[model samples]
Target chain A: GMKQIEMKIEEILSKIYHIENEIARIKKLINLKANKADAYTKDQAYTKTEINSQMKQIEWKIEEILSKIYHIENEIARIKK
Target chain B: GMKQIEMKIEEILSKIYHIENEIARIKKLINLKANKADAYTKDQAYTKTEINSQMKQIEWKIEEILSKIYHIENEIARIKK
Candidate 1:
């Protein structure tokens, strides 16, 4: 019985472990996108209107990704309890 | 006819926008947990074994949350396409 509980805990932990690596990778991607958008916004070569609209679109996409990540974290908090 | 598509797009974007705020809140929580864990790990007042195990548990909880966030992002990617 004890062994059974231990095994289950280990399984859950392993699942979390793998996902943690994935989360880190995604975080990097988010940062990369943000930096790219910033660079574009700062570039005087692009018209202000063009940069603003384009950044809005890019930000929307980033938000979508962030929202998903948020939902995942919410689940984790729930599971911990 | 074009208005219908535009409306749907607006609806989706609104949903994503609300979720984006939620993601920011959760990210702040995560960072708080991380900082707490870091401070605890650095404190030599507690036995290393105790600190290590406690940190592991806290980390597992964090990872579970991260996994959920990752899944949410995956869904967003699917929706975008």
Candidate 2:
């Protein structure tokens, strides 16, 4: 089942990369916005609130996947041992 | 300082979205790889290991970002109060 485990590991690693890039892009955009001192109009405020809510949801999902990956890693380690 | 806080929140949200999409793409690719039961050649194994190491680093970054976001959120709430 090394192949199976290896495949799983690859999958998890891919996820990690995907999430990292996603975070990186957002951070870049955020910095861009931060550098601009525009007034927070109602539209901006509402969008900010919506984004914040979505971030919370995304954070939860990341945690969920992280936990799954951790468990799978442990499983692989056990099998190798 | 609501504007400042709003900017920060928006920044954080953007990061969350970026990371989520990144993860989603990786997951999709992994699934594609998983469906194929090819033997793990040395090259494939090495690549997988490299990816695994990278994932650990990415995980750490995500956690750091998450903490920062949480703290900022708390700060915003405090200011509002």
Worst 10 residues of 2 chain B by lDDT: B34-43
TM-score of chain B of each: 0.42, 0.43
List, residue by residue over B1-81, the lDDT tens digit for candidate 2.
655655655565576667677666755654443211343333233343454465567668777866765665565556546
Off by over 4 Å in 1: A35-81, B1-81
The regions of model 2 sitting more than 4 angstroms off are A1-60, A63-81, B1-38
Each model's TM-score?
Answer: 0.25, 0.26
| Predicted complex 2: CAPRI docking category | incorrect
- lDDT by residue for model 2 (A1-81), tens: 456555655665676676667667655544433211333333333343554665576678688667755655565566557
Q: Against the correct fold, how does model 1 do in TM-score?
A: 0.25
Chain B TM-score of candidate 2 stands at 0.43
Local lDDT at B16 for model 1: 53
DockQ comparisons of all candidates to the true complex: 0.02, 0.02
Query: Scoring only the second chain, what is candidate 1's TM-score?
Result: 0.42
